[PDB]
Amino acid sequence: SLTQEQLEDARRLKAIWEKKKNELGLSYESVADKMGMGQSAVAALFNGINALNAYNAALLAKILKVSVEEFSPSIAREIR
Amino acid sequence: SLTQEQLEDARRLKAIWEKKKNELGLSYESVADKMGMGQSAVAALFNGINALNAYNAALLAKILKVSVEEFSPSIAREIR
């Protein structure tokens, strides 16, 4: 089970994805491919089924062209 | 024109960027946004085209999770 804060991280992440995927030219398929992971594995992060870690948070921040803190202030402090 | 020390600051900064950008989840775009500037201006600082100042050096050090002196000993003194 995810903590409340991990569910809030995922909600912020999914909202950034939904806001930016068109301008980034990305799809449900192509962002998983960019992350070298399965489609449902990435959806799992966005939808709050699996929690983020520092590896995944960093890779998604780079792909989405945002700061980690915009979806996970806690991972962003600790990656720090 | 940059002095040799200013060019070394940039060089040392670029080396830290190359070392830490992936693990920290950094992109030119996310850095540019934090720095209130464009992506080419960020690159110009890394590439020794424009010189660092105290504000940009402090913010880049925070972003890269390093002390300023790791790339600019002279500007670190100015901040002190």
Distance (Å, rounded) from C-alpha A32 to C-alpha A42? 6
Q: By the CB < 8 Å criterion, does B38 face chain A?
A: no
Asked if B34's CB is within 8 angstroms of A62's CB, the reply is: no
Chain A, chain B: beta-carbon pairs less than 8 Å apart = 33
Query: Is residue B38 helix, strand or coil?
Result: coil
Please give the C-alpha separations between residue B22 and each of A24, A54, B31, in angstroms, as whole numbers.
Answer: 19, 11, 13
Contact between B60 and B49 under an 8 Å Cβ cutoff? The reply is no
Q: By the CB < 8 Å criterion, does A40 face chain B?
A: no
CA atoms within 13 A on the CB side of A61: 30
DSSP annotation of A69: G
Residues belonging to chain A: 80
Burial class (CB in 10 A: 0-12, 13-18, 19+), B32: middle
H or E segment to which residue B58 belongs: helix B54-64
The string over B34-72, giving b where at least 16 C-beta atoms fall within 10 Å of a residue's C-beta and e elsewhere, is bbeeebeebbebbebebbbeeebbbebbebbebebbebb
Query: Is residue B59 helix, strand or coil?
Result: helix
Asked if A80's CB is within 8 angstroms of B30's CB, the reply is: no
Experimental method: X-ray
The string over A48-79, giving b where at least 16 C-beta atoms fall within 10 Å of a residue's C-beta and e elsewhere, is bebbbebebbbbbbbbbbbbbbbbbebbbeeb
Q: Which domains does chain B have, with CATH numbers?
A: 1-80 (1.10.260.40)
